[PDB]
């Protein structure tokens, strides 16, 4: 249906000349997924990311079309959203939001987050997950590299599909049922969230000083990693981490249920992250 795929796109792609609708293009990267540029919507000022795809000379495409069909009808402030798509000659242009700033990863390693800050980003991530799940979407890669932080402290979840891949080791974030090849569901994201929360408080990944296979083994049997000083953490937080890191999938908290968790109530303002983000952006490059 190489001619039918070109027909379906036409019913989804939007009108207009993206070369007119967007300005200040800037090549960020280039690969098999196509060429990516950051740009700005002339009318609204909205900063965006444009993926120019090779089209014809690019693998499976009605899966890409499937995401478009799914995400174009659903939006959320906590996930990198799909804005528009265009057809320019022999190419396909996908436009996504682009959040300036840094990664939670850089913020975790260079600075020291507190439970107020951790609780703030967990709520934002929970909101994104609750939204993605209600849409029958499993992220599968919830980790510090996939959550974007605006200088605003605002939080966005990315890399949950082809369209929203990161514009530019061991599975430490994967759940037991994943590492053991079992059938899994949405809750594997809750597990990953717990791991992320742990990474934040430790300012470092789970299994750094461990062989890959052994780490997988530990995840499959011990479940939660070991904290250097579990006592320091509070009761509501540990309780939070426990609802997230329960091996019994069905006793494990869900996104919705976890929104109501007391730990979030202790959240600080996202603006509280600005100096950490700023400080983090200074070092790395």
């Amino acid at each position: 249906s190489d001619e039918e795929i070109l027909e379906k796109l036409r019913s989804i792609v939007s009108v207009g000349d993206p070369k007119k609708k967007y300005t200040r293009f800037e090549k960020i990267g280039q690969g098999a997924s196509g060429t990516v540029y950051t740009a700005m919507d002339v009318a609204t000022g909205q900063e965006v990311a444009i993926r120019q795809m090779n089209l014809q000379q690019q693998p499976k495409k009605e899966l890409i079309i499937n995401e478009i069909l799914v995400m174009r009808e659903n939006k959320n402030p906590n996930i990198v959203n799909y804005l528009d798509s265009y057809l320019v000659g022999d190419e396909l242009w996908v436009v996504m939001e682009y959040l300036a700033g840094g990664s939670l990863t850089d913020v975790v390693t260079e600075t020291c987050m507190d439970e107020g800050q951790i609780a703030a980003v967990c709520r934002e991530c929970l909101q994104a997950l609750e939204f993605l799940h209600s849409n029958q979407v499993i992220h599968r890669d919830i980790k510090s590299d996939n959550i974007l932080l605006g200088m605003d402290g605002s939080v966005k979840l990315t890399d949950f599909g082809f369209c929203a891949q990161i514009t530019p080791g061991t599975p430490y974030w994967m759940a037991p049922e994943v590492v053991t090849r079992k059938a899994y569901g949405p809750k594997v994201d809750i597990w990953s969230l717990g791991i992320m929360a742990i990474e934040m408080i430790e300012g470092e990944p789970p299994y750094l000083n461990e062989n890959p296979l052994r780490a997988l083994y530990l995840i499959a049997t011990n479940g939660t990693p070991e904290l250097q000083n579990p006592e320091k953490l509070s009761a509501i937080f540990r309780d939070f981490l426990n609802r997230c890191l329960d091996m019994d999938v069905e006793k494990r908290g869900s996104a919705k249920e976890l929104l109501q968790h007391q730990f979030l109530k202790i959240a600080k303002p996202l603006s509280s992250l600005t100096p950490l983000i700023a400080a983090a952006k200074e070092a790395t490059k």
């Binding site: 899966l63 995401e67 499993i138 599968r140 599909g161 082809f162 090849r181 296979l213 049997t221």
Partner: protein
């Protein structure tokens, strides 16, 4: 080590605490990873499940796409 072609299925002898019919690679990753004998005896399936996952995480390619529920 030549002649007749055959298939051997992996096994675990709970009494001796050792896997049987383990392919060369797997046997190598196992003893170097320090997965103890006791841990193996504790949940042999998990150990085999993890070996599988590991050596499969060398085949699939980075190109990630949306994953949906059932």
């Amino acid at each position: 080590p030549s002649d007749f072609e055959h298939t051997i299925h992996v096994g675990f002898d709970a009494v001796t605490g050792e896997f049987t019919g383990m392919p060369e690679q797997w046997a190598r990753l196992l003893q170097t990873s320090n997965i103890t004998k006791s841990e193996q005896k504790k949940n042999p399936q998990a150990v085999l499940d993890v070996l599988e996952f590991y050596n499969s995480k060398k085949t699939s390619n980075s190109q990630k796409y949306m994953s949906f529920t059932d």
